[PDB]
Design a protein around this ligand. Structure first.
Ligand code: SF4
Ligand SMILES: [Cl-]
Ligand SMILES: [Zn+2]
Length: 178
């Protein structure tokens, strides 16, 4: 059994190709503003209601976002294996392992492994650290593969799933605008 963190609906659509019997965990205080949080949570909720997935929605609140912030407020650098995005992702998966340890699941994972390739090493390193600290096994698979990716793209266009074009945080939204 496994608890899977959900980053976004596109990546959930890819992940269910490979693993459909998970409890899913949408927890993303890294997202600003709230209107973008809600639009993405409603994407996922659309996917879950259509495929009858078990999704649990974590906390989003002026507190939670603030724990996130100061947790990454020291760093000014973006990208895989940047310190900031390592503390970020580590914040999210820490909460997912916490929830999985509380609920008794044996393993945790994340739809972040449905993301481009080049991100897998950083996410695997974080997962293993977290595993060590909380005693929930980190499950690693490249979810893009075996056609899952273009399946999940197929359904994204058929179902009108919102596909975001920035990471989530205000830093990356400045980044996209450049
Ligand atoms: S802002 Fe960029 S690096 Fe910061 S958490 Fe979101 S995606 Fe990761
Ligand atoms: Cl992503
Ligand atoms: Zn995502």
């Amino acid at each position: 059994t496994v608890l899977i963190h959900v980053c976004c609906a596109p990546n959930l659509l890819t992940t269910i190709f490979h693993v459909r019997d998970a409890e899913f965990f949408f927890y993303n205080p890294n997202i600003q503003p709230l209107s973008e949080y809600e639009k993405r949570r409603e994407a996922v909720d659309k996917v879950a209601n259509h495929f009858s997935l078990n999704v649990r929605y974590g906390e989003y609140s002026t507190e939670e976002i603030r724990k996130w912030y100061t947790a990454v407020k020291d760093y000014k650098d973006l990208g895989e294996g940047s310190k900031r995005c390592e503390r970020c992702i580590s914040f999210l998966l820490e909460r997912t392992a916490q929830e999985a340890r509380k609920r008794g699941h044996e393993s945790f994972s994340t739809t972040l492994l449905a993301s481009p390739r080049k991100n897998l090493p950083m996410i695997e390193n974080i997962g293993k650290t977290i595993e060590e600290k909380y005693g929930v096994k980190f499950f690693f698979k490249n979810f893009r593969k075996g056609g899952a990716y273009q399946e999940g793209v197929r359904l994204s266009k058929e179902l009108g799933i919102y596909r975001q074009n920035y990471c989530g945080c205000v830093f990356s939204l400045l980044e996209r605008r450049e």
